[PDB]
Amino acid sequence: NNLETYEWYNKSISRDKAEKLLLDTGKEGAFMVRDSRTPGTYTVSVFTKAIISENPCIKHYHIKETNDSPKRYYVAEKYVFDSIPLLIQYHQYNGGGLVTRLRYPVCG
Secondary structure, three states, X not given: OOOOOOOOXXXXXXXXXXXXXXXXXXXXXXXXXXXXXXXXXXXXXXXXOOOOXXXXXXXXXXXXXXOOOOOOEEOXXXXXXXXXXXXXXXXXXXXXXXXXXXXXXXXX
């Protein structure tokens, strides 16, 4: 379930690389993900060209897990899903409440 198939998912990735890798794209709301640990939560690298100080903008959103039914993973005590793709899917549309949610998943 490494979602190693989502334009946004990035395995073995690090918060440091996803920014650089995401920055390479230059998308507004670029979205990426990186596996972590714990209950099995995944990381989400979201970046959107916009940072007078240091642009573009790349944020790392981790998918928290909450033994639900399924409502397990989530990033903001907002909406917890049974997987990053879904959790990403909802962030790819719903519009979450971050830089710009899954505006555009980015993978390296």
